[PDB]
Amino acid sequence: PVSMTKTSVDCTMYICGDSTECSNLLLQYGSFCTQLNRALTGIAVEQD
Amino acid sequence: FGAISSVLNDILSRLDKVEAEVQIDRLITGRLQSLQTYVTQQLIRAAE
Amino acid sequence: PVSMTKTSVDCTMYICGDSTECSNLLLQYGSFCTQLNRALTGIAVEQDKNTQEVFAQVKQIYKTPPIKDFGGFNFSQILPDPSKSKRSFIEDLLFNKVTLGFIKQYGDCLGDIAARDLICAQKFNGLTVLPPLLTDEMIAQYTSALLAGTITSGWTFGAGAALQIPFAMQMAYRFNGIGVTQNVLYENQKLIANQFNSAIGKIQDSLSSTASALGKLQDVVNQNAQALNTLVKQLSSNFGAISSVLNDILSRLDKVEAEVQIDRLITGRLQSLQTYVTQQLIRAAEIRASANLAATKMSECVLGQSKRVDFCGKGYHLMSFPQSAPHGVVFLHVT
Amino acid sequence: FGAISSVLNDILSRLDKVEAEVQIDRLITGRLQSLQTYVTQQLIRAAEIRASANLAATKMSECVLGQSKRVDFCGKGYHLMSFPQSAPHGVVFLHVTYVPAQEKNFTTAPAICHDGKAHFPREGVFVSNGTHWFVTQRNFYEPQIITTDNTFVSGNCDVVIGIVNNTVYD
Amino acid sequence: ALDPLSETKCTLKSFTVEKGIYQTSNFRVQPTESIVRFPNITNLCPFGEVFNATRFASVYAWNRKRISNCVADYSVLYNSASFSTFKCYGVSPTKLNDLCFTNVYADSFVIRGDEVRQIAPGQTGKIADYNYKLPDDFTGCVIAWNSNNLDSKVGGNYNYLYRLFRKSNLKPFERDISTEIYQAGSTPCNGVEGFNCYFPLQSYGFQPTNGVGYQPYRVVVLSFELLHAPATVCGPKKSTNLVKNKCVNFNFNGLTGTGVLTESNKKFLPFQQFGRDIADTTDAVRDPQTLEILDITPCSFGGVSVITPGTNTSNQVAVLYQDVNCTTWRVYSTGSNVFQTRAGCLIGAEHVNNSYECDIPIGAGICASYQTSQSIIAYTMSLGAENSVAYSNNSIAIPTNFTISVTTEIL
Ligand SMILES: CCCCC/C=C\C/C=C\CCCCCCCC(=O)O
Ligand SMILES: CCCCC/C=C\C/C=C\CCCCCCCC(=O)O
Ligand SMILES: *[C@@H]1O[C@H](CO)[C@@H](O)[C@H](O)[C@H]1NC(C)=O
Ligand SMILES: *[C@@H]1O[C@H](CO)[C@@H](O)[C@H](O)[C@H]1NC(C)=O
């Protein structure tokens, strides 16, 4: 094996959906998702 | 995750501004932890 | 890369601060902080073995002779100059390309400097960095010993006692190893020496220009700082509570209404620390792999002559020279 | 984990179903987190163990089933052989190596000059015991006499730096 | 908490400790004094004009008064005032005596008893839909008490009104004094009342024999904010002096905490009172008397390690302070063998001039051991027995013998 599948995640769309009440509440964290996407972007850049 | 439902539209259809926060917070916490676990296991898989 | 940064965390200072109520409430977990610190201590202890394995291959600090007496080659730029951190020219060039545990007194961070320096804001929250056990001067002395053994004894100094041999009579051997006879070397010694010198000069001129070329060693520092600054910023999250400040919770609420809100913050910040430690454990493994590769190159490329293809450089290998950099090592491969 | 007790039978002996679910959910969450941490750490250790196992599998092939030429891979010194032994959760290798013992100093020069033609040793190096000139191998001093079979000729004696003058026989 | 050795014993959870170096808690400094700084206020609040008035308003045209520059010692109500209902939402009742309040408003009106439960967030009734509504993020206190001897007459009191028949529900703190004929059906109305057009106001009866639930109640809603702005209103607490450059517990206008107070060059604006660093923590405040700016700095800062040879050979130890340059005061003890390495101030070990191998690693090339009366010594580590090589120009060394080694490798 030489590579795996690259992925990306929208945390607002997975957690809150189309609701606008959950998004305002999730803003109170706001910095744990960017971490996730940073890690996943590293993985994706490494697989190439 | 310890809430009365797993559908935000079934929660926001019965409970008001304040009685609904205590449940959406549980759902947020749980789904954030799910994403964290996913990313951690993918980080461990990419090293192999 | 050969190493990363060591860290330590007082969890009572990060989570609770100076409040006694929170520190009494935090005894009800009591078993995870010791675990976190166990992990971090394992990392920190591994980070010095990663260096002892690379640079401390030999335990005889060989010295360089006054008059060179080499066949025409010039190691003035890799060998030291006692004038100066008795490093070398190229090593100095390297250290002035990577930016960044030293003493920082409470009298310095006292005032507005705190909350404005990014290193005092950590220490005020229980996060500390630890100095490495080997200083840069020791590492450079090790490197100089390795270089001076390579240059005066060939490879014999890695299989027992060190036997001396002229440099050209050594390059003849290194030639016969790839498939070229001796006469080729004894009959083009001057030209080969000139080409070698010009190659090293081009190296020096490209490293004296204004291109970094050392990103693999800078990204380490950048990641290690970003992690701690992200951790410091993560303290402004409410985690489901009415506020992120314990004193505001304790100035308006009694002993009963306040636990409901302080336990949320405790849990959140404990999870933050858990995540930090997990990611550090995962990066330490990459660093360990790279350190083992470097320790294999220092023995197959510096202490001998490799026959593997594209391991000790691109082409038919002749030799290699080590140099120390911040958190890593650099090899100059002569092919 | 923020509850009134760590024993479910004290929670269930004093509180009803509604008041007790609130307290049991917290314990569930915390213990689940504990197990997740356990499993993550075991996954991170299995990787180290796998790397060590792969290195041992490489050493068995390259040091036992053959003779390695890499430096410091199988032992300290010039490798000869190896022998495996089994130990609890691991393996032990007994590496046999050759190590030089007693050094002696000589003077040397390449490209011997008999008559206008340079001679090179073709295997080994030239040495002198003070007055005579022999050719010998590199890792064990066994001197021989210099003839035209153990050397070869190349060019004339006008370039090499170190060339000396002596007699080669046939 | 007797010494770092006991701390590491309690950490490892054992009465024996193996030799090495361990990390301990950071250097903590404890306070010596307590400081309190409230504004300079002299007069009392109008508890009389509010709670003991002669005519209260109506719930549809409720009244809203302002409170400023006063001292809230509610103990004066304990004499003749008796409150049937008292409920606070964003603050605990046992802390109303230690705070200062920002924008205090008092809303007053009269209702019937069985409607007092409607004065709260999310209640869905006649008084919360058409007459008076409260936010969902209400911070304040609700107070209510019976008035069946003042607001009730012997033949019926019809001077208190409530709004029936509104087209849509009200919003928080929004008033409505309109009197326009309400149309029930779809047929139009032209200011005349019949069979589908009703006057949207009606009056209680408030007789003196009416039963609980039909008896009058007076209500007072107090609204305010906390710990964000000047707060000209304050409670009954007597202040002290100001102690700079010392670790003190403080209470600035209701904000507690502990630290060191120092002068600042920052310049605020006339509508600012706090500093709120990146992490939402205060790092500056304006004194409410001298109007000067002060910084705030924690007292705990450090990093401390313990060197131990083993509790089965000795019980002497050494201590390493990583952020102290003893060449001296931020220490537990001073001892008599200070060294001041580059990794900190080492206290408890004798420095030597020799060079051995590392037994216990410390940092920056320093190591420690248990040498010979036995003590702890600290020194600079060795690197491997300096040697030299004899490269002249034309000499070579050749071996004449060999050895067969046998080494081990565990995996
Ligand atoms: C004029 C209003 C001033 C408002 C000042 C701000 C907050 C004061 C809070 C509560 C004051 C009323 C407390 C009721 C007295 C206790 C009940 C009793 O009497 O037994
Ligand atoms: C006759 C059975 C109808 C049941 C319909 C189902 C749900 C209706 C729910 C609640 C109705 C109660 C009305 C209370 C009136 C508000 C209080 C008041 O101000 O008086
Ligand atoms: C309000 O009026 C009463 C008289 O009934 C009086 O006793 C009381 O002192 C007044 N309230 C306060 C706080 O003084
Ligand atoms: C070689 O070494 C062995 C011991 O290792 C010794 O007994 C023997 O005499 C040596 N041989 C010579 C030629 O000295």
Numbering used by the authors:
A (entry chain C): 725 to 772
B (entry chain C): 967 to 1014
C (entry chain B): 725 to 808, 810 to 825, 829 to 1063
D (entry chain A): 967 to 1136
E (entry chain A): 292 to 618, 632 to 676, 686 to 724
What does the paper behind this entry write?
Model building of the closed form revealed additional density in the RBDs in our structure. In our structure, a hydrophobic pocket mostly shaped by phenylalanines forms a bent tube into which the LA fits well. The anchor for the headgroup carboxyl is provided by an arginine (Arg408) and a glutamine (Gln409) from the adjacent RBD in the trimer, giving rise to a composite LA binding site. In previous apo S cryo-EM structures, about 60 to 75% of the S trimers were in the open conformation, in contrast to our observation of ~70% in the closed conformation. In the apo SARS-CoV-2 S trimer, a gap between adjacent RBDs places the hydrophilic anchor residues ~10 Å from the position of the LA headgroup. Upon LA binding, the adjacent RBD in the trimer moves toward its neighbor, and the anchor residues Arg408 and Gln409 lock down on the headgroup of LA. Overall, this results in a compaction of trimer architecture in the region formed by the three RBDs, producing a locked S structure. The RBM, central to ACE2 binding, appears to be conformationally preorganized in our structure, indicating a generally more rigid RBD trimer when LA is bound. Although direct cross-talk between the LA binding pocket and the RBM is not apparent from our structure, the conformational changes in the RBD trimer could affect ACE2 docking and infectivity, as indicated by our SPR assays that show reduced levels of S binding in the presence of LA. Glycosylation sites are located away from the LA binding pocket and are largely native in our structure.
The attachment of SARS-CoV-2 to a host cell is initiated by the spike (S) protein trimer, which adorns the outer surface of the virus, binding to its cognate receptor angiotensin-converting enzyme 2 (ACE2) with higher affinity than the SARS-CoV S protein. Structures of trimeric S protein show its receptor-binding domain in either an up or a down conformation. Toelzer et al. produced SARS-CoV-2 S in insect cells and determined the structure by cryo–electron microscopy. In their dataset, the closed form was predominant and was stabilized by binding linoleic acid, an essential fatty acid.
